[PDB]
Design an enzyme around this catalytic site. Structure first.
Site, PDB file in Angstrom:
ATOM      1  N   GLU A  17       0.815  -1.214   0.000  1.00 39.89           N
ATOM      2  CA  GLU A  17       0.000   0.000   0.000  1.00 39.89           C
ATOM      3  C   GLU A  17       0.849   1.264   0.000  1.00 39.89           C
ATOM      4  OE1 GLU A  17      -4.245  -0.604  -0.150  1.00 39.89           O
ATOM      5  OE2 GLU A  17      -3.152   1.280   0.185  1.00 39.89           O
ATOM      6  N   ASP A  26      -6.508  10.365  -1.708  1.00 40.56           N
ATOM      7  CA  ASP A  26      -6.654   9.223  -2.601  1.00 40.56           C
ATOM      8  C   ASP A  26      -7.453   9.644  -3.839  1.00 40.56           C
ATOM      9  OD1 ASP A  26      -9.210   9.439  -1.563  1.00 40.56           O
ATOM     10  OD2 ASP A  26      -9.059   7.633  -0.320  1.00 40.56           O
TER      11      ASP A  26
HETATM   12 CL   LIG Z   1      -4.356   6.796  -6.333  1.00 40.26          CL
END
Ligand SMILES: [Cl-]
Ligand SMILES: [Cl-]
Ligand SMILES: [Cl-]
Ligand SMILES: [Cl-]
Ligand SMILES: [Cl-]
Length: 408
Positions: A17, A26
């Site tokens: 991750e 994000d």
């Molecule tokens: Cl991303």
């Protein structure tokens, strides 16, 4: 050395991750920190700084330490396991799996969510029946496998073996241009000259296609910033503290150049093949001999006696007839020949390279290593059977010729 490779779920997901110590956005616009720890859904930045300070018990200004990110990660692991144990499609498989394969399953939930993982109905039954090889093959037939190839490979290998070995050395492959795009994005120059990474409108259309391609592999994120693990790899090659630089001639075919670089606690292997660059981030547990072996492969040691009472180039101008015929064939017609030099960086920004080099020879009679010695001001050379122990000895001797005298 290091025959029992010790991993854990945090290092696994740090690699897959990516660990972020600074507040992050994000693709969905949500503010995030640590390893995918969701801070807030709000389209606002300030709401995120508020939530982060609550979870940490400190005024942080959007910046946490690795220990703090581990705390948040542990809560997310609990939440993910709590979710798995309450999902009738995942609880039976999770209960049956060993701790390592459980971490692999938690790994998938982190990426694609609890519902997405339950969609691997076939692979989940194979795992429950301990049909490791079948599950690994079947998982590779998903869009997940092609969307994030490097991550899925490691997770699938982990599902297959139930060990951590897939995370000893994690690799990405990029073209020389992709490498330049990454370095440009990260403010990086001063790469090892041995890798030949050298610095308008035409370049832009070339790099915008490369950037689009790197985004497709997950090497670049949604805003065009590198994955933290790739960022770690490329950064380690920029102004490393130590390096092993090797020239590798192969009788079976062009000289391959590769580097082993240390910066702080990170180790990176970089092999250049034409216009292709393979980077591998190496777990601290691995030794220098293992990193070099990872590039060169294993080989049987040549049953020879030591040949260390040798002065520099005197080797190339009291042994047995048998021991003489073996050594002659090794050096005269070797299948492969590697010479490795070492360097160190000084605080002031300068570097020193060794003049002497450690050697690795493959031949029909087995592998041989060459260990350099500076005794009384003259360069000596010692040939030893090419065991991983003697290879480590040759690399130890090479490094001892640096001003610091150690790899640290
Ligand atoms: Cl991303
Ligand atoms: Cl499936
Ligand atoms: Cl199987
Ligand atoms: Cl990936
Ligand atoms: Cl030297």
């Amino acid at each position: 050395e290091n025959l029992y490779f010790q991993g854990n779920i945090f290092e696994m997901l740090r690699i897959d991750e990516g660990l972020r110590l600074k507040i992050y956005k994000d693709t969905e616009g949500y503010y995030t920190i640590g390893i995918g720890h969701l801070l807030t859904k709000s389209p606002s930045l300030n709401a995120a700084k508020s939530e982060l300070d609550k979870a940490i018990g400190r005024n942080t200004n959007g910046v946490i330490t690795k220990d703090e990110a581990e705390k948040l990660f542990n809560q997310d692991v609990d939440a993910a396991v709590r979710g798995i144990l309450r999902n009738a499609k995942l609880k039976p498989v999770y209960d049956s799996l060993d701790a390592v394969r459980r971490a692999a399953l938690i790994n998938m939930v982190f990426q694609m969510g609890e519902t997405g993982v339950a969609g691997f109905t076939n692979s989940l039954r194979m795992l429950q029946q301990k049909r490791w090889d079948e599950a690994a093959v079947n998982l590779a037939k998903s869009r997940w496998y092609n969307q994030t190839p490097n991550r899925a490979k490691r997770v699938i290998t982990t599902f297959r073996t139930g060990t951590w070995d897939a995370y000893a050395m994690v690799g990405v492959e990029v073209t020389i241009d992709g490498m330049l795009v990454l370095a440009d994005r990260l403010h990086l120059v001063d790469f090892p000259v041995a890798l030949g990474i050298r610095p308008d409108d035409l370049r832009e259309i070339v790099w915008d296609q490369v950037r689009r391609d790197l985004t497709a592999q997950g090497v670049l994120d949604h805003n065009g910033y590198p994955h933290p693990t790739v960022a770690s790899m490329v950064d380690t090659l920029s102004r490393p503290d130590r390096t092993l630089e090797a020239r590798w001639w192969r009788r079976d075919v062009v000289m391959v150049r590769f580097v082993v670089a240390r910066k702080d606690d990170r180790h990176v292997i970089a092999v250049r093949n034409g216009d292709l660059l393979v980077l591998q981030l190496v777990a601290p547990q691995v030794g220098l001999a293992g990193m070099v072996t990872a590039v060169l492969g294993t080989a049987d040691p040549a049953s020879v006696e030591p040949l260390t009472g040798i002065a520099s180039e005197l080797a190339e101008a009291g042994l047995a007839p048998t021991a003489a015929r073996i050594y002659t064939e090794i050096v005269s017609n070797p299948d492969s020949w590697v010479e490795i030099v070492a360097s160190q960086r000084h605080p002031g920004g300068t570097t020193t390279h060794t003049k002497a080099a450690a050697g690795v020879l493959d031949s029909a009679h087995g592998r041989v290593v060459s260990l350099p010695r500076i005794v009384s001001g003259e360069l000596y050379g010692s040939f030893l059977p090419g065991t991983p122990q003697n290879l480590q000895l040759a690399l130890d001797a090479l490094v001892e010729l640096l001003p610091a005298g150690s790899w640290l």
